[PDB]
């Protein structure tokens, strides 16, 4: 109740919807009472927003004589609360200091709802983790950009990997959802057009159980001789459940798991089942650590950081102590916060931190190019920039081309989507180790590191090529890659 | 004469009078045979017209589903030829094909006066891009005249507020006699006198005499050396250079402060090689940024491709002093032949008032758009109320027009069809090893005068004082009206038995 907002003043104010708290319980959905505080998706991304705007105001090349402000609201990873705060943006325009554009939110569905709201008022929205290829349609989501690649780009990466190693007959398993269905149908179309055959579409949920995973493993073994590669558009723990199935049913290394981004180099899926895990090839989303972010965030102190209102709550929650003498001091904590406490103690940077920073820079560069166009000779905001036109800002943001925080030359296509830049990992008995890269179609790889020799490359084919004497290829009737050699 | 016209088709056609050629020789004024081609005032402004109409037709927000055409005629900077071409405008208007809705230009203020006197007879709105003379401010006499440039009176107001800001009560005045000197000087006199500033004397000097008259006038200016030191200069370009040559000759090196006009704003040919006496002067420059997209268009042009501009072959041959072999408009008497490597980027200088030409074209376009939005509310193109366009209605729309210019300016016209003044103040300072340069010191935006006080002067003591009489002691004031000047008094002791009635008499 009476939600707080971390807002920074400036000549231009950019809205931000971060997931500071967890989504409310099933009970309080009609009440909108968020859960515990979130470290990575919350406080870290809020501080990223704040310090990135500070660093952008510091830069004299980008937006000179203009101050960038923000208004950071808690989305709580739930469509309803995000809609509440987006409505607060829409009314807070009212025309103090209207919101030019919104950053986020996290979830793709929550992003869809926030976009359906914002496009009604011509407010450009840039996402940092919304990947579902439903948002690629710009007739339905006119003002939606994103610095992350769609799920279709990842399915394209898997298609070209299966292509490169001449795997014509492959099985398919996906975690059913708005990600499984999407990635799997994109993979099906792309593979079928490239000349690859699928056994059929297998869907397994993560919370099925330790018997449905075994039934699905047997349904996958029902194609044991011909197919050996299982294209896996799967969540994180779905791969661990299938590795537990490989342990149970004793299929140790009888199949090749082409892992998705859910299982990229995340140890918690393999550890203690590393036996069956060896051999798998996984797609990881290339995300380097933003050094200067860590340098800023790890120095923070609740004694000093007052602009982030959730930082006192976060300090008490992370260290399970009580910030004695502070305004947001909470009881029910037995221990008291020691002055030695530091954020460096077991610090893990946010998964997609680089993408949050890149989206903030995307908004900043769009505003800067709009100022350079509308106000040619002016340094700050001339009368064409007062007020900023949402339509014109969108026009500029669609054209935006800049070099990201990690060296990426990030730019948006006609559909407001960003190019895919993944790195391929192989789980080898030495750990996930890098084996190649995928840059928007350009697939380079270390062929003689995933396999020792050219003979070791597992073959996945339904029917062997017909004899030079006995050539006549005849379609059996069930699959296109299964023929009968007749005279 | 069979003059050629650069015309572009459209649903609405806008006339334009640009100065493609020089004005005819004194002999051929009754013959109307124009001179050499002009790069900046000519070809550049013609291409500006054409490409600006292209870019406006590209915009779906401004005039959607309507095509803007034009008819670009050579005014030759001479009243007679401009009247000829304006007559062709008004007659193919009367005949209907494709009447001329409005005219852009011309350049000269006198030629603008004549063209306006012609056009207003047929209710054709005219927008000027360089006609500044404040004679055109009267709308009872020039009912259909707009202009995106400020009047000369706005510039005199800028000088008045500059003299005001630095407490310069007693200043001398010099102007180049003409339709600009007289105007600016009388406006300055009225404004200064109302603000509380006195004039030492108003000297008028012509640009063509000199080397004796400049020295006599410099001596007449020195006849007030101690009291007055600031000389408000409503002067042409080379008049300031003549006065700097006088300062060189008579050895008055930095004995006076020259408050320069737009004739000498950052115009180097006035200072160069006399930069010694030029240092210190404060000049008003008309803020004109470079139109990037214009250059991007113009510098790519090629006579092999550009056929819509008929003068482009002549211009290509003249600028590069070569011969366009194999072309229809190929001219002899050129010894060299045109190389295929030749580019317009070679020593390119954008037109002085290019932004204003583009802003005038946009003014006409936005006026037409607002007229279409009013007459035809739901319609996209031209309904029957827009067929035909009423000159009176178009004028009504253009007077109310308010839009954001090419450079971010909020261009709008007042009740007198004049635009707000947006000037920038320059100071000629010695910047290091023999590097003399005009440097920005502040801005004047229709009354709002911002400035960098501690950059034109190092300290508050360095600010030159220009005052006739020092303030009288508070006890014994008795300021005496001599009878000749309004603010030049003599401080006298008030009679011991008399009382201090006011600050003027006892
Ligand atoms: C504008 O920016 C310059 C640096 O580029 C700075 O020196 C100046 O103080 C700024 N002025 C305003 C009014 O922001
Ligand atoms: C992106 O911008 C750079 C300049 O920083 C330019 O060289 C490059 O061609 C641009 N690329 C695209 C695709 O616009
Ligand atoms: C206006 O022009 C567009 C093309 O830009 C065309 O599709 C549309 O049909 C036109 N509208 C009318 C009413 O003619
Ligand atoms: C002008 O005089 C007033 C006092 O009448 C003073 O306050 C002001 O600073 C002066 N301005 C300048 C530029 O000297
Ligand atoms: C054309 O230009 C090139 C480069 O400027 C020059 O080397 C060449 O000699 C020129 N050709 C003629 C015929 O002058
Ligand atoms: C802009 O134009 C409108 C015409 O409707 C006028 O009322 C308004 O005063 C103009 N803006 C300014 C700042 O004068
Ligand atoms: Mg900045």
The protein residue whose alpha carbon is closest to atom 3 in ligand 3 is B65
Residue A461, preceding peptide bond in cis (omega within 30° of 0): no
Q: How far apart are the first and last CA of chain B?
A: 78
Distance CA(B278)–CA(B265), nearest Å, equals 12
Interchain pair B292, A376: CB under 8 A: yes
CA distances from residue B162 to A362, B52, B448 in whole angstroms, order as listed: 44, 37, 11
Helix B181-195 and helix B152-165: axis angle, to 10°? 40
Minimum CA–CA partner of A380 in chain B: B408
The length of chain B in residues reads 506
Q: Give residues whose Cβ lies within 5 Å of ion ligand 7.
A: A 57, 59, 63
Minimum CA–CA partner of A371 in chain B: B408
State the distance from the centre of ligand 6 to the C-alpha of B402, rounded, in angstroms: 6
Q: Chain B residues with CB inside 8 Å of A377's CB?
A: 287, 289, 407-408
Pairing of β B230-234 and β B170-175: parallel
State the distance from the centre of ligand 4 to the C-alpha of B499, rounded, in angstroms: 30
Could you identify the atom of ligand 3 that is nearest to the CA of residue B60?
5
Whether ligand 1 lies within 6 angstroms of the CB of A65 is answered as yes
How far is the alpha carbon of A378 from chain B, nearest alpha carbon, in Å?
A: 8
Distance CA(A287)–CA(A355), nearest Å, equals 8
Q: How many A-B residue pairs are in contact by the CB < 8 A criterion?
A: 26
Could you identify the atom of ligand 3 that is nearest to the CA of residue B65?
1
B407 in reach of chain A (CB within 8 A): yes
Q: Please, which residues bridge with residue A135 across strands?
A: none
Distance CA(B290)–CA(A214), nearest Å, equals 72
Q: Chain A residues with CB inside 8 Å of B406's CB?
A: 376
DSSP-assigned letters across all residues of B189-203: HHHHHHHT-EEEEEE
| Residues in Cβ contact with A351 at an 8 Å cutoff, skipping those fewer than 6 apart | A40, A287
Partner residue opposite A378 with nearest CB, options B292, B406, B408:
B408
CA distances from residue A177 to A108, A204, A264, A472 in whole angstroms, order as listed: 12, 10, 19, 42
Q: How far apart are the first and last CA of chain A?
A: 79
| Residues in Cβ contact with B22 at an 8 Å cutoff, skipping those fewer than 6 apart | B34, B35, B36, B37, B38, B76, B77
B102 by Cβ neighbours in 10 Å (0-12 / 13-18 / 19+) ranks as buried
| Residues in Cβ contact with A339 at an 8 Å cutoff, skipping those fewer than 6 apart | none
B289 in reach of chain A (CB within 8 A): yes
Closest CA to A45 of A294, A301, A353, A346: A353
Q: Chain B residues with CB inside 8 Å of A384's CB?
A: 404, 408
Distance CA(A182)–CA(A131), nearest Å, equals 11
Angle at A16 between CA A373 and CA A133, to 5 degrees: 85
DSSP-assigned letters across all residues of B291-358: -HHHHHHHTT--TTT--SSTTHHHHHHHHTT---TTSTT--SS--S---TT--TTTT----TTHHHHH
B292 in reach of chain A (CB within 8 A): yes
Q: Please, which residues bridge with residue B440 across strands?
A: B426
Left if phi > 0, otherwise alpha if psi is -120 to 50, otherwise beta: which for A448? alpha
Per-residue HEC secondary structure of chain A comes to: CCCCCEEECCCEEEEEEECCECCCCCHHHCCCCCCCECHHHHHHHHHHHHHHHHHHHHCCCCCCCCCEEEEEEECCCCHHHHHHHHHHHHHHHCCCCCEEEEECCCCHHHHHHHHHHHHHHCCCEEECCCCCHHHHCCCCCCCEEECCCCHHHHHHHHHHHHHHCCCCEEEEEEECCCCHHHHHHHHHHHHHHHCCEEEEEEEECCCCCCCHHHHHHHHHHCCCCCCCEEEEECCHHHHHHHHHHHHHCCCCCCCEEEECCCCCCCHHHCCCCHHHHCCCEEEEECCCCCHHHHHHHCCCCCCCCCCCCCHHHHHHHHCCCCCCCCCCCCCCCCCCCCCCCCCCCCCCCCCCHHHHHHHHHHHHHHHHHHHHHHCCCCCCCCCCCCCCCHHHHHHHHHHCEEECCCCCEEECCCCCCCCCEEEEEEECCCCEEEEEEEECCEEEECHHHHCCCCCCCCCCCCCCCCCCCCCCEEECCCCCCCEEECC
C-alpha of A314 from chain center: 24
Q: What does this entry list as its resolution, in Å?
A: 4.0
Closest CA to A347 of A410, A305, A293, A384: A293
Q: Are B240 and B174 in contact (CB under 8 A)?
A: no
Distance CA(A162)–CA(A169), nearest Å, equals 10
Distance CA(A42)–CA(A33), nearest Å, equals 16
CA distances from residue A178 to A7, A209, B54 in whole angstroms, order as listed: 33, 21, 47
Distance CA(B107)–CA(B128), nearest Å, equals 7
Whether ligand 6 lies within 6 angstroms of the CB of B404 is answered as no
If DSSP codes are grouped into helix, strand and coil, which group holds residue B269?
helix
Q: Are A279 and A302 in contact (CB under 8 A)?
A: no
Distance CA(A447)–CA(A33), nearest Å, equals 52
What kind of experiment solved this structure? X-ray
Could you identify the atom of ligand 4 that is nearest to the CA of residue B165?
13
Q: Please, which residues bridge with residue B435 across strands?
A: none
Distance CA(A421)–CA(A41), nearest Å, equals 22
Q: Please, which residues bridge with residue B126 across strands?
A: B103, B145
State the distance from the centre of ligand 6 to the C-alpha of A275, rounded, in angstroms: 76
Ligand 3, residues at Cβ distance < 6 Å: B 65, 380
Q: Tokens 């607002």 appear where?
A: B370
The protein residue whose alpha carbon is closest to atom 8 in ligand 3 is B65
Q: With a CB-CB cutoff of 8 Å, which residues 324-383 of chain A face chain B?
A: 374-378, 382-383
Tokens of B234: 């409503």
Q: Are B219 and B250 in contact (CB under 8 A)?
A: yes
Q: Tokens 């009047």 appear where?
A: B151
Tokens of B87: 């007559």
How far is the alpha carbon of A384 from chain B, nearest alpha carbon, in Å?
A: 6
Tokens of B451: 């400035």
Cβ atoms within 10 Å of B32's Cβ, excluding its own:
15
What's the number of CA atoms in the CB half-sphere (13 Å) around residue A345? 8
Closest CA to B361 of B16, B3, B5: B16
Interchain pair A375, B408: CB under 8 A: yes
Q: Are A278 and A253 in contact (CB under 8 A)?
A: yes
CA distances from residue A261 to A176, A379, B261 in whole angstroms, order as listed: 15, 44, 69
DSSP at B170: E
C-alpha of A164 from chain center: 25
A69 by Cβ neighbours in 10 Å (0-12 / 13-18 / 19+) ranks as middle
DSSP-assigned letters across all residues of B482-496: -SS-SS-----PPPS
| Residues in Cβ contact with B226 at an 8 Å cutoff, skipping those fewer than 6 apart | none
What's the number of CA atoms in the CB half-sphere (13 Å) around residue A195? 6
Q: Please, which residues bridge with residue A204 across strands?
A: A175
Angle at A318 between CA A313 and CA A320, to 5 degrees: 85
Tokens of B79: 């009243």
Tokens of B158: 């800028």
CA distances from residue A142 to A126, A133, A397, B483 in whole angstroms, order as listed: 12, 14, 12, 77
Whether ligand 2 lies within 6 angstroms of the CB of A403 is answered as no
Partner residue opposite A382 with nearest CB, options B290, B292, B408:
B408
| Residues in Cβ contact with B249 at an 8 Å cutoff, skipping those fewer than 6 apart | B211, B214, B215
DSSP-assigned letters across all residues of B101-136: EEEE--SSHHHHHHHHHHHGGGT--EEESS---GGG
Whether ligand 2 lies within 6 angstroms of the CB of A401 is answered as yes
Q: Are A155 and A233 in contact (CB under 8 A)?
A: yes
Helix A79-93 and helix A108-118: axis angle, to 10°? 30
Tokens of A83: 């809609």
Tokens of A477: 């009737």
Distance CA(B221)–CA(B230), nearest Å, equals 10
If DSSP codes are grouped into helix, strand and coil, which group holds residue B404?
strand
Ligand 5, residues at Cβ distance < 6 Å: B 339, 341
DSSP-assigned letters across all residues of B271-283: HTT-HHHHTT-EE
Closest CA to B402 of B444, B446, B370, B438: B370
- Binding-site positions of A read 41, 108, 129-131, 179, 261, 352
The backbone torsions φ and ψ at residue B92, rounded to the nearest 5 degrees and listed phi first, read -70, -10
DSSP at B35: -
Distance CA(A161)–CA(A281), nearest Å, equals 10
DSSP at B37: B
State the distance from the centre of ligand 6 to the C-alpha of B419, rounded, in angstroms: 13
Tokens of B279: 């240092």
Could you identify the atom of ligand 3 that is nearest to the CA of residue B381?
13
Whether ligand 6 lies within 6 angstroms of the CB of B400 is answered as yes
Closest CA to B376 of B355, B393, B361: B393
Cβ atoms within 10 Å of A455's Cβ, excluding its own:
7
Distance CA(A89)–CA(A103), nearest Å, equals 12
Distance CA(A430)–CA(A266), nearest Å, equals 16
B408 in reach of chain A (CB within 8 A): yes
If DSSP codes are grouped into helix, strand and coil, which group holds residue B252?
coil
Could you identify the atom of ligand 5 that is nearest to the CA of residue B339?
1
Left if phi > 0, otherwise alpha if psi is -120 to 50, otherwise beta: which for B288? beta
Q: Are B487 and B169 in contact (CB under 8 A)?
A: yes
- Binding-site positions of B for L-glutamate read 41, 109, 130-132, 180, 262, 353
How far is the alpha carbon of B403 from chain A, nearest alpha carbon, in Å?
A: 9
State the distance from the centre of ligand 2 to the C-alpha of A401, rounded, in angstroms: 6
Tokens of A354: 């680089």
The backbone torsions φ and ψ at residue A233, rounded to the nearest 5 degrees and listed phi first, read -95, 80
The backbone torsions φ and ψ at residue A171, rounded to the nearest 5 degrees and listed phi first, read -95, 160
Distance CA(B423)–CA(B438), nearest Å, equals 14
Q: What share of chain B is helix, strand, coil (3-state, %, to 5)?
A: 35, 15, 50
Element (H, E) at B502: none
């Amino acid at each position: 109740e009476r939600r707080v907002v971390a807002h920074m003043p400036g000549d231009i104010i950019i809205g931000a919807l971060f997931s500071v708290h967890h989504q409310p319980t099933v009970d309080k959905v009609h009440e909108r009472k968020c859960g515990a505080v979130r470290e990575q998706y919350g406080i870290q991304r809020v501080e990223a927003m704040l310090h990135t705007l500070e660093r952008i105001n510091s830069d004299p090349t980008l937006l000179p004589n203009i101050t960038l402000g923000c208004e950071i609201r808690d989305s709580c990873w739930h469509s309803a609360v995000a809609l509440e705060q987006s409505i607060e943006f829409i009314r807070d325009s009212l025309i103090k200091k209207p919101i030019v554009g919104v950053i986020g939110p996290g979830s793709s569905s929550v992003a869809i709802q926030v976009q359906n709201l914002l496009q009604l008022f011509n407010i450009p929205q840039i996402a940092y983790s919304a990947t579902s290829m439903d948002l690629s349609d710009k007739t339905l989501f006119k003002y939606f950009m994103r610095v992350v690649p769609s799920d279709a780009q990842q399915a394209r990466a898997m298609v070209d990997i299966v292509k490169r190693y001449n795997w014509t007959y492959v099985s398919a398993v996906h975690t059913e959802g708005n990600y499984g269905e999407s990635g799997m149908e994109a993979f099906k179309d792309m593979s079928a057009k490239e000349g690859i055959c699928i056994a059929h579409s297998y869907k397994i949920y993560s919370n099925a159980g330790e018997q449905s995973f075994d039934k699905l493993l047997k349904k996958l073994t029902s194609h044991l001789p011909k197919a050996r590669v299982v294209a896996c558009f799967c969540e994180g723990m779905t791969v661990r459940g299938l590795l537990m199935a490989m342990r149970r049913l004793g299929l140790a290394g009888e199949f090749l798991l082409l892992g998705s981004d859910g299982w990229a180099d995340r140890y918690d899926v393999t550890d203690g089942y590393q036996r069956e895990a060896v051999g798998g090839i996984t797609i990881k989303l290339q995300s380097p650590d933003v050094k200067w972010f860590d340098d800023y965030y790890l120095k923070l102190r609740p004694e000093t950081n007052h602009r982030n209102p959730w930082f006192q709550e976060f300090w008490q929650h992370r260290f399970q102590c009580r910030l004695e003498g502070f305004p947001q001091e909470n009881s029910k904590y037995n221990k008291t916060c020691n002055s030695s406490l530091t954020l460096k103690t077991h610090h893990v940077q946010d998964s997609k931190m680089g993408f949050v920073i890149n989206a903030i820079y995307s908004m900043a560069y769009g505003l800067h190019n709009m100022q350079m166009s509308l106000c040619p000779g002016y340094a700050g905001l001339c009368d064409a920039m007062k007020p900023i036109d949402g339509r014109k800002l969108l026009e500029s943001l669609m054209k935006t081309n800049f070099t990201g925080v990690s060296g990426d030359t990030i730019l948006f296509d006609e559909n407001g989507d960003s190019p895919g830049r993944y790195e391929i990992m192989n789980f080898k008995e030495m750990d996930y180790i890098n084996v190649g890269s995928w840059d928007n179609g350009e697939l380079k790889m270390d062929d003689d590191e995933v396999w020792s020799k050219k003979s070791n490359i597992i073959r996945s084919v339904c029917s062997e090529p017909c004899e030079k004497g006995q050539i006549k290829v005849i379609r059996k009737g069930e699959v296109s890659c299964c023929w009968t050699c007749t005279p």
